[PDB]
């Protein structure tokens, strides 16, 4: 809080100084007076320019906000990718006569796919809540939203309500109490609402509600001149897809006084701060909903053990009678011994679970649509030995026959696979079995019966090829069902390649196939057990190092994996990678093998199909070199001292020579590849210095960079050298007299080109950084080095500023560099060499040129009068 208040106070102070045209502040943080203490003229200039750009940004933001407040909300929502949906359920103005349940979710009309799950709230039969606790403290937050969800062309919230009570809302017969009947679906457009342009939590927008037909008072009573009506009543015979599309497309619904008051509020962030800073909207008892989707900000420790099973559609024939059988999915959780578990099914997120869960009821529909999503939570060890059954019980009109009749057909789904995998995500169909009632009740029997499409089809294929101990039973009916599985858990494995990596000892024949298929595996399923996969790869390349193609494919697979890790979506897992490097990385001889493999890679860079692989390897060199360094130091500490240190240093030197050869070969086919290789080469050498000789590394890099031709891609190599000087030059005890001449030579080559118009910024950055490392207080002796610098780094800057006397470019950087240079050196260096220049006429020319450049610098200075 102190830091943020200091920052905003300083910003407003500088804003006031700018608007009145007065003196602003310096040293934005920790004191604001610490800049004029001869700390760093370069840092002072950088503070100047960052302050100026902040001034421009704040003034343009003020100009934008003086008229419209649309950019601020978009910027706030684009700052992070973790949102929350807040529903202000005030009241539900209606009157039906049975218990009411709420089910809201997120649906995309254009993608025709649901996004979020559903949460249930107990509601009474006459517009009151069954539980008065949620009457006023109804605080719900639906998390797992990001910018890519908001960038949807049409964002809508789907709200469907299912009643609880009797079958019919009339008299004539008695019906069982405690069963569900769907009523209707209400959808509102929340496109502009989720953009946060107007914050109005008090406003409660009434949403028109559309339902299925329930009244026959006006539609059929008056029909004259042709009475011929032979039809039925459509109670629940409306497919959900078409009705949902029609409701979304509709602009107004004649609800006749039915609906509810809700307002949608978007609170950025997660439960860490919304329960403290947004306590007025998010209380402690706020329900949290987890969307069935992979997160965008994939942070470590994102615990989610939710198993989502969704019912969409299912074929149900009429059968013996013209009325199709009444089907309710009486599902329960069972272990390996078929024992019922308690509180494992959670239809609503944030509500207490139920041991047994039933489905909704349709009015004898041939192909009903369910769209029923429920969540199952089991222990990570227990879920590996659990089974789920789907018993379908026929329900009659009268309560006695409704409760006496048992499950006519029983379905089931396996949560594991014999090979080790889990149920793959995607559309899966189901087949229900009827007739016998004893073979589907003994738990030990139906463990190996067909209950899912893939296992059923593989069993029938095995029966076709070998009709022994496996035959297709004739108990199957003419009906079918469909389920949608999207398990957003952390211990599942929906990949045979994943287990093949895990248990390659069992199936080492398909190692080649596994390595080939590793190149298209989804990133999330990889990073779920990336540590295990990397350990398996390390073991594979350790104990099986006889076949060269195995090593090549393992190297390619690890390059692909580490490139995926280095992507913008997995910076949070990089600390996890480093922690695993420090704690579980047990490679001892893998470093030399990896070094030899990459030496072969660079020495054989001539292949065209190898271009992208080598580009990825060069991009991800940093982390693989971290791995190599860890393995080498582990070997050193386990063996005390390694006689292989000298040969590994020779291997590194040979790698540098191979890089020199790669630079020497024509650039016509590897422009971007060699540019990136130059870009990311010094990434690890800072850490390599800790174990390799700094003098040898410095001289090898000097030779490597002096071998670079000076005719192609000057800005890229200048940026590479900017990164070079930034790193390890502060450790100047052995890299002053070898690195400074290199910088001097490169700047001298930069000097006279007549095309240095964009190179000015790079030269300014180089000068700034070298001056920084020269004036650092943790350096020590810099007398002779600064002496040589002022010997050959003053006439050239004088000449450059004379050339760029034009007032358009960023002269101020050069001005800061030259003033820092002139002030840093004391009179001793001037007397030693600046006064000891060449012949008298030439020094007179020098003096007059200096006077001219001085009067031009002072004459019409081009600062921003700030």
Curated annotation (Swiss-Prot):
<comment type="function">
    <text>Guanine nucleotide exchange factor (GEF) for Rho and Rac. GEF proteins activate small GTPases by exchanging bound GDP for free GTP. Along with DOCK1, mediates CRK/CRKL regulation of epithelial and endothelial cell spreading and migration on type IV collagen.</text>
</comment>
<comment type="subunit">
    <text>Interacts with CRK and CRKL. Interacts (via N-terminus) with tensin TNS3 (via N-terminus); the interaction increases DOCK5 guanine nucleotide exchange activity towards Rac. Interacts with ELMO1.</text>
</comment>
<comment type="similarity">
    <text>Belongs to the DOCK family.</text>
</comment>
<feature type="modified residue" description="Phosphoserine">
    <location>
        <position position="226"/>
    </location>
</feature>
<feature type="modified residue" description="N6-acetyllysine">
    <location>
        <position position="679"/>
    </location>
</feature>
<protein>
    <recommendedName>
        <fullName>Dedicator of cytokinesis protein 5</fullName>
    </recommendedName>
</protein>
<feature type="domain" description="C2 DOCK-type">
    <location>
        <begin position="304"/>
        <end position="488"/>
    </location>
</feature>
